[PDB]
Structure formats: structure tokens, C-alpha cells
Enzyme design. Structure first.
Site, PDB file in Angstrom:
ATOM      1  N   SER A 136       2.344   7.212   4.554  1.00  0.00           N
ATOM      2  CA  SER A 136       1.437   6.268   3.920  1.00  0.00           C
ATOM      3  C   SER A 136       1.647   4.859   4.465  1.00  0.00           C
ATOM      4  CB  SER A 136       1.639   6.308   2.388  1.00  0.00           C
ATOM      5  OG  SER A 136       0.587   5.668   1.699  1.00  0.00           O
ATOM      6  N   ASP A 137       0.608   4.029   4.370  1.00  0.00           N
ATOM      7  CA  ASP A 137       0.655   2.668   4.839  1.00  0.00           C
ATOM      8  C   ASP A 137      -0.395   1.875   4.078  1.00  0.00           C
ATOM      9  OD1 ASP A 137       1.960   1.038   7.112  1.00  0.00           O
ATOM     10  OD2 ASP A 137      -0.129   0.440   7.276  1.00  0.00           O
ATOM     11  N   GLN A 138      -0.092   0.619   3.767  1.00  0.00           N
ATOM     12  CA  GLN A 138      -1.049  -0.219   3.031  1.00  0.00           C
ATOM     13  C   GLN A 138      -1.182  -1.551   3.691  1.00  0.00           C
ATOM     14  OE1 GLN A 138      -0.208  -2.343  -0.878  1.00  0.00           O
ATOM     15  NE2 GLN A 138      -1.361  -0.596  -1.630  1.00  0.00           N
TER      16      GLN A 138
END
Lengths: 182, 192
Positions: free
Chosen positions: B67-69
Site C-alpha cells: 500500500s501507498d498513500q
């Protein structure tokens, strides 16, 4: 005026702590039984403000917060389940949009100023199985209940947990107690 | 563990615990530097996938989560402010505006090579803030290492008019509703 939370819910207490204003919790003395004519919205508005107003004598120079929450399962008002209760509620929810109504009141017991608000939150449930319902049993939107949902739709996730904090911040701002200035 | 979290984020660990499935964590091996012309959605899609796949050789029979934001303010990726000046600058840009977070998610099944990816937005609608409010927030919260200069799970609630998105967890940094769907597609429903 000092801040009072008219609830002994540890959920509501924890939420209110996010605003960083000192407060004291007190148990209000209120009958929460729905009246036959009563809409979900009417009920939580009434109970929110009764909870706040009920403490006005014990805390007569205060800002007092009252709140109340129900959901509607196929038009039908439902509060805390209190284990076979919990299971039933899941079965009705499966595949449906479940609306929670959360009432909020801020009462200034010193001058009598009252603010009220009712805020809905919609939980879109997945189609469940008795297996996964049985497996889940035995919701907690901040926890494992996330496994049950398709989508959560509402102004403020805190409302769903049980206190409309955005709405409360505004009420506090009207009373000259912006949490940001405390 | 059949489930692996390709992350060193302590909050992603904490969020994943909510599903009550056995997992462990390992640090992904990727370069998070944006490439020229890369859009926010492309960036978080790419990084989510890359983090998950970077553990394939270490965990070759596993479901691996990446995941990455990113935080986007007026079309531009916005980073950690580092200074109180920059924190006030970011909150000025946020005031009476919408801050959008884009969160990429990937589940890579290394046993059968199935890769699932998604990007999910979350919009934080700000109140119109005064300079005093902005100054006071930065002084109280010291959000100097948060991209966008606010913490949505805490005191930051004092700044918002509304929060709009599918899943509150997405805003915190792991799309859990979406991840549950990916896990069910691979026959690892958390409810079972």
C-alpha cells in the site's frame, strides 16, 4: 463554563477526548424507551437533549453534552443489542443499507442556550452468509466489523462510532469554546 | 502466516490487525521517488504493486499486501512540511478547500502470481480557517512530519467540515474494505 459529558459510554468518552477540552462524565437519568409515534430522528434528538438537560441541576454553570444513537433495520428502530440480540441485527442488515441516526445536544445550563443536531450515517452491508454471520458472531465499525461492509457514507466517521464531533466542534464554537482556542 | 504486509508503517500494521488474520510484516524494497509526469494515482498504484512484489522471492507461497498513500492539494502531491512555517502554509492551502488522499492497494499471491490492485480516494473538506486557528493547530499538534500538516484521526477533526470516502481506514492509510474484497477473491475471507 466547564464541559460535561452526559454519558458513561467509554466510546463517547474516548471520542470527546480528541477535542482536548477537559471534561467530566456524568450519568444522565433518562428513560430511552421509544414512543409509538416516534421517528428515529425525533427519538435521538429528544433523548440527546433530555440527557443534557437532565444534568442541569447537578451541573448548573456548565456546557453539557448529550447524545443518542439508534439504527433502523428495515424501518424498525434498534438500539444496543444486549448475544442472540447481536446475531439478529446482522441477519436483517445483510445486503442492505443500514442508517444510524445520532442526535447531539449542547446545553448551556448557565444561560439556557440549547443547540441540537441529528446526523445520519449509512452503512452499506455486503450480502452476508449465515456462516460468516455465525463466524462474526460474536458491530464495531472501528474494528472487525469492517469485514461486513461494502461502503460507509456519512459526514463524520466519529458519528458512526457514537458522537458527532464535527457537529460538536461547531456547537462549541458558537458558545465561544472553539477547541482550537482552548 | 500465509498473509504478509509489505510495509514498515506501524499504523498499517495496526490497521491490518483489525481483520484478525495471522500475518507478519517485512520491509519492501522499492524507490518511492516519483517519476517525471507521474500522476498521484499512478504513483500510489505503482508503489503499492512494487512493495507487494518486492517480497515475492522472500515469501513465494503467500498473499502479500502492499500500500501507498499520497496527499494532494490543488492537483499537487504534498509532502511533510518539516517546519512550522510550512505546516501553516499547507493548512492555508487546505482552508476552505478539499484535500484528497489517494491510497493504492495491492494483493500479490506469489503461489499463483495473481496480482490485484486498486486506488481509492478520500476527500477531507476543510472549514474556512482563520490565521489564529491555523497557528493554534500547528502549536498544539506539531504535525511537522504529516503530509498535509494535519492528523485526521485526532485533533484534526477540529478543522474539518466533512469527510467523504468509502472507508475511514483508507484515510488512515490502508483500504480495509477493498483489502477484504481482495482477500475474499483469493479464498482468504477474514470472516472465515
Amino acid at each position: 463554563p466547564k464541559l460535561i459529558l452526559a454519558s458513561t459510554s467509554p466510546w463517547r468518552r474516548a471520542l470527546l477526548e480528541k477535542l482536548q477540552i477537559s471534561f467530566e462524565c456524568a450519568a444522565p437519568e433518562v428513560d430511552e424507551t421509544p414512543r409509538s409515534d416516534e421517528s428515529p430522528r425525533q427519538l435521538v434528538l429528544r433523548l440527546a437533549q433530555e440527557k443534557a438537560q437532565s444534568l442541569a441541576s447537578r451541573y448548573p454553570d456548565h456546557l453539557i453534552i448529550g447524545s443518542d444513537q439508534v439504527c433502523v433495520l428495515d424501518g424498525e428502530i434498534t438500539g444496543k443489542p444486549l448475544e442472540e440480540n447481536a446475531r439478529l441485527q446482522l441477519r436483517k442488515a445483510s445486503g442492505n443499507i443500514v442508517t444510524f441516526y445520532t442526535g447531539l445536544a449542547l446545553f448551556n445550563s448557565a444561560n439556557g442556550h440549547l443547540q441540537t443536531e441529528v446526523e445520519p450515517f449509512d452503512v452499506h452491508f455486503r450480502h452476508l452468509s449465515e456462516a460468516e454471520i455465525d463466524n462474526y458472531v460474536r458491530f464495531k465499525s472501528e474494528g472487525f466489523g469492517i469485514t461486513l461492509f461494502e461502503r460507509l457514507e456519512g459526514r463524520d466517521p466519529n458519528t458512526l462510532v457514537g458522537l458527532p464531533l464535527i457537529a460538536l466542534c461547531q456547537m462549541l464554537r458558537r458558545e465561544g469554546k472553539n477547541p482550537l482556542m482552548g
